[PDB]
């Protein structure tokens, strides 16, 4: 809070915050990509997909 | 000294050669596997090797003479080839086995045994011919459904299933006079081989017409005969290209010479003045690659065939090339041109002034077949020569630009991307 209860302190602190997290999802995100990359999406069979795949 | 041709029912078609020691008479029929339909495909080439079977051969030997036959798409042919002087002996033996003899070679026990025969030797082209093997494919995906689709050798599944009566049904259709041309190459005379033919009488099926079928068709299309068991890829692309006799016949011929053939063990191969070249060796992105132009009745094919062990790479040998094609239409400099000009002349003159009289007799058969004279190297040389930049330009943004293509290919193809991928690079972006 910064004080005593959700007062100035909190939102300014909230909205600065709220600026920086989405970079950090982001980078979270890419990470999430790296993940996917080493062996590629799944499929709908649920069998592997390396006999044939398509750009 | 300009080949004569002469006819009296039987078209007779002569180009005598002083410098020849030897000689070779034929009949070349102006058909081929393109008259042959799904089910008997296979019997012309098994009537070649009947003509070859043993029996005949053995008793041409004894005369001193030599058998040669040719499958084609549009035709096929019958040569004997013999020293300048038994000449004669060559009509004989041709006469009788194309008038006189019937049940002799047509036996229980010959064909049979030359059935299989050629049943082995397809087996064996489809086994482990892969780059022939993939441009019969090129052919058959191209062409589907058309009568230039069709194998030459035949295939497996209809040649097991041929007999005599298909053998005879096929002759009594094509092997007739009004689709035949009797040829005469090497050191022969054509008055020597014109009274030895009209000394004889007869006239066996006269007046008789082959029969007619449906034209042939392009279909942008593909076919993968994926086998990673093998140690390269083998594959063959093309776009529609021209027929014979077609107004830029020779326009697509310097094309094809501007990318040329290579072989990437050869070091005078791998100096050629082709930019391709530049592209493809730094990474060694293949064996060996020779363009084509290919040229037929009806149809024709314009492209590539090429082997590669950079099974990882593939993507980029197809890219580099069509992206080389592209060029044909906005880019080809004079230089090119001039180059590909010299070296077709070259290709020509090796084709045509051959040492060869039985590879003189087919292409003379061949083409007084089709538009009842041979043309001339002087004539050739002189349209070439004519050939310009912007008639490349123009022939290229018509055949090759944004247009649809024909794809084989055989061996470790993991690498060779998705049709639509291939096709979108034979275009560049542009503002
Ligand atoms: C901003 C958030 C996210 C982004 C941008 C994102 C993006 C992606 C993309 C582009 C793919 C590949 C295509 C697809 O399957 O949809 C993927 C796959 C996947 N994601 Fe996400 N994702 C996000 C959040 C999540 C969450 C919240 C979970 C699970 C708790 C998740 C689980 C997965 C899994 C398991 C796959 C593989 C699916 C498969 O191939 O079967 N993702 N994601
Ligand atoms: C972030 C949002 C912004 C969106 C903006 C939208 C972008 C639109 C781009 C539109 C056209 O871009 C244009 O695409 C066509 C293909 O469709 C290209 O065409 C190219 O490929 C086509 C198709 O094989 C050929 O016929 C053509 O001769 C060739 O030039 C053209 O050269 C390019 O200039």
């Known amino acids: ?55 | 000294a300009e080949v004569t041709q002469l006819s009296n029912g039987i078209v007779v078609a002569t180009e005598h050669n002083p410098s020849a020691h030897t000689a070779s008479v034929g009949v070349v029929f102006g058909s081929g596997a393109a008259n042959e339909n799904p089910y008997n495909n296979g019997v012309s080439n098994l009537w070649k090797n009947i003509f070859l079977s043993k029996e005949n051969s053995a008793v041409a030997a004894k005369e001193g003479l030599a058998l040669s036959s040719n499958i084609s798409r549009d035709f096929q042919s019958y040569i004997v080839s013999s020293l300048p002087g038994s000449t004669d002996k060559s009509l004989d033996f041709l006469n009788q086995s194309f008038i006189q003899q019937k049940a002799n070679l047509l036996s229980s026990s010959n064909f049979e045994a030359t059935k299989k025969s050629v049943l082995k030797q397809v087996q064996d082209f489809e086994d482990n011919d892969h780059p022939n093997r993939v441009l019969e494919h090129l052919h058959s995906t191209a062409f589907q459904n058309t009568p230039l689709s069709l194998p030459t050798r035949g295939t497996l599944e209809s040649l097991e299933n041929l007999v005599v009566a298909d053998l005879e049904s096929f002759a009594n259709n094509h092997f007739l006079n009004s689709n035949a041309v009797v040829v005469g190459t090497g050191n022969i005379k054509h008055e020597d081989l014109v009274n030895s033919i009209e000394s004889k009488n007869l006239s066996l099926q006269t007046g008789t017409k082959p029969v007619l079928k449906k034209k042939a068709a392009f279909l942008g299309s593909e076919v993968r005969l994926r086998d990673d068991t093998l140690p390269k890829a083998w594959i063959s692309l093309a776009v529609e290209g021209e027929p014979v006799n077609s107004p830029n016949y020779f326009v697509a011929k310097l094309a094809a010479q501007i990318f040329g053939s290579y072989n990437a063990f050869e070091p005078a191969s791998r100096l050629q003045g082709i930019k391709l070249l530049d592209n493809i060796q730094e990474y060694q992105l293949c064996d060996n690659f020779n363009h084509f132009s290919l040229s037929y009745k009806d149809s024709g094919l314009w492209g590539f065939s090429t082997a590669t062990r950079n099974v990882t790479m593939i993507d980029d040998l197809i890219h580099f090339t069509l992206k080389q094609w592209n060029r044909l239409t906005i880019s080809v400099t004079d230089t090119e041109v001039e180059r590909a000009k010299s070296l077709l002349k070259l290709q020509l003159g090796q084709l045509y002034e051959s040492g060869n009289p039985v590879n003189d007799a087919n292409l003379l058969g061949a083409e007084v077949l089709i538009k009842g004279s041979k043309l001339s190297l002087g004539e050739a040389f002189k349209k070439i020569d004519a050939i310009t930049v912007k008639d490349v330009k123009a022939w290229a943004g018509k055949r090759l630009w944004d247009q649809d293509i024909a794809i084989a290919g055989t061996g470790q193809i993991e690498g060779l991307l998705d049709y639509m991928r291939i096709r979108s690079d034979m275009s560049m972006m542009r503002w």
């Open chain 1, 1 to 55: 809070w910064g004080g005593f209860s959700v007062s100035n302190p909190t939102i300014q602190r909230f909205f600065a915050l709220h600026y920086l997290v989405p970079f950090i999802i982001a980078a979270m995100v890419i990470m999430h990509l790296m993940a996917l990359h080493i062996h590629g999406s799944s499929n709908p069979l649920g069998i592997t997909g390396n006999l044939d795949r398509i750009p």
